[PDB]
Amino acid sequence: MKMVVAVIRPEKLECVKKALEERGFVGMTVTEVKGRGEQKGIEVDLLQKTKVEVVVSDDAVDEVVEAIVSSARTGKFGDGRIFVIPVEKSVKIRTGDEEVAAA
Amino acid sequence: MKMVVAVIRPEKLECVKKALEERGFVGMTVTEVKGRGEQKGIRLQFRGVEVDLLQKTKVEVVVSDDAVDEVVEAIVSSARTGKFGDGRIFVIPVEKSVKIRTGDEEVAAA
Amino acid sequence: MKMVVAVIRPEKLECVKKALEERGFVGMTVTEVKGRGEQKGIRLQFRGREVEVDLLQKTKVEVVVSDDAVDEVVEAIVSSARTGKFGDGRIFVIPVEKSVKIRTGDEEVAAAHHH
Numbered sequence: 262m263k264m265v266v267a268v269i270r271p272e273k274l275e276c277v278k279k280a281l282e283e284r285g286f287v288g289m290t291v292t293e294v295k296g297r298g299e300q301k302g303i304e305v306d307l308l309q310k311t312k313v314e315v316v317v318s319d320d321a322v323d324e325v326v327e328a329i330v331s332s333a334r335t336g337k338f339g340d341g342r343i344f345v346i347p348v349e350k351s352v353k354i355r356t357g358d359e360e361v362a363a364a
Numbered sequence: 365m366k367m368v369v370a371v372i373r374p375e376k377l378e379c380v381k382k383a384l385e386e387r388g389f390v391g392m393t394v395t396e397v398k399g400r401g402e403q404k405g406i407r408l409q410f411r412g413v414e415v416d417l418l419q420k421t422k423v424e425v426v427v428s429d430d431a432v433d434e435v436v437e438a439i440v441s442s443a444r445t446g447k448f449g450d451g452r453i454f455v456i457p458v459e460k461s462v463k464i465r466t467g468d469e470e471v472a473a474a
Numbered sequence: 475m476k477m478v479v480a481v482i483r484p485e486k487l488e489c490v491k492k493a494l495e496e497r498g499f500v501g502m503t504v505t506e507v508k509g510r511g512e513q514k515g516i517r518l519q520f521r522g523r524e525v526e527v528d529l530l531q532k533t534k535v536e537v538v539v540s541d542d543a544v545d546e547v548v549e550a551i552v553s554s555a556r557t558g559k560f561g562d563g564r565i566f567v568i569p570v571e572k573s574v575k576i577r578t579g580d581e582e583v584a585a586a587h588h589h
């Protein structure tokens with residue numbers, strides 16, 4: 262399992278949600294954040310961004326990453342980043358069932 | 365070490381904090397988030413919206429490898445209702461844990 | 475790569491921001507959070523009575539860097555965020571397997587793994 266962490270422009274949230282839902286990735290956690298890098302800033306200098314976290318099976322990562330890149334990109338500085346983090350266990354609170362990679 | 369990341373119903377925060385404190389797990393970082401999944405969206409269509417991302421609470425607790433199963437069980441027991449939308453717990457590896465005030469760094473090796 | 479996750483006092487954000495950009499670490503993601511641990515506070519309030527609170531306001535700073543830059547990033551945050559008092563915060567170092575730049579579609583992975 263992996264956690265796909267995307268930091269995007271806030272106006273791209275609807276595009277990203279749609280692109281993920283279409284491919285069967287309905288579950289996601291969204292956080293309002295701020296950030297900086299190569300951009301700025303007409304500065305402040307921390308601009309509003311949106312963090313989208315999706316925990317998926319190892320084999321779905323490339324599909325999820327590609328779905329987010331395609332829906333969040335503009336080609337301009339400030340599009341954001343996607344960080345892939347290992348997840349050792351994913352537990353569904355209501356059932357107690359836990360998802361692990363067979364290994 | 366591991367970071368136990370729980371995404372729960374906001375009204376369960378007090379229950380989760382209590383269940384963790386009683387087992388000796390006092391340290392935690394809490395974030396207000398939104399989410400979607402299996403759970404049905406809120407509507408709310410007032411005349412004269414929508415709201416598909418529901419309010420949730422993220423609880424992050426960094427613990428030793430051997431305490432994970434106890435922390436996970438404490439959160440499942442205190443955050444569950446049995447209804448769609450209870451949330452998830454994700455266990456992420458933590459390689460180093462630094463206490464800013466002392467500069468002391470915890471590292472694991474097995 | 476690694477994600478350096480620092481949970482600091484909110485008033486230290488500007489110091490941390492400055493100490494990181496000084497060393498060439500311009501990219502960062504900042505989140506407003508709450509927390510608790512060793513530090514206790516307020517426990518002191520105005521109204522004639524009222525003496526509560528639980529989770530104190532904190533700031534999370536996340537910076538994704540190459541493996542060899544971690545110790546420098548950690549030291550820069552420790553130096554700029556410390557007061558010496560309880561509640562200064564923590565730094566957690568988490569592994570990052572892939573780092574994608576959305577605008578170009580270019581993905582950074584660690585060389586030593588297939589594929």
Ligand SMILES: Nc1ncnc2c1ncn2[C@@H]1O[C@H](COP(=O)(O)OP(=O)(O)O)[C@@H](O)[C@H]1O
Pocket residue numbers: 268295296297298299300308310337338339340341342500501502503504536537538539575576577
């Ligand atoms: N090394 C990094 N660590 C953490 N977050 C980062 C990092 N670099 C960029 N970000 C995040 O991604 C957002 C966009 O980054 P930026 O460098 O300005 O975009 P881009 O590389 O597409 O031009 C930032 O506002 C910040 O939230």
Ligand SMILES: Nc1ncnc2c1ncn2[C@@H]1O[C@H](COP(=O)(O)OP(=O)(O)O)[C@@H](O)[C@H]1O
Pocket residue numbers: 287288289290291314315316317353354355371398399400401402403418420447448449450451452
């Ligand atoms: N794959 C996922 N990645 C990230 N967050 C998720 C994921 N699936 C669910 N969530 C989070 O858990 C919350 C509850 O998920 P939901 O599917 O509605 O119910 P349940 O936990 O009972 O399956 C969501 O609102 C979201 O915050």
Ligand SMILES: Nc1ncnc2c1ncn2[C@@H]1O[C@H](COP(=O)(O)OP(=O)(O)O)[C@@H](O)[C@H]1O
Pocket residue numbers: 391392393394424425426427463464465481508509510511512513514530532559560561562563564
């Ligand atoms: N085990 C932990 N897991 C997650 N967050 C923690 C943990 N311990 C501390 N924190 C975070 O760091 C902040 C400060 O921690 P605290 O123990 O009160 O003081 P100090 O960090 O100086 O030891 C907390 O308010 C919380 O946001």
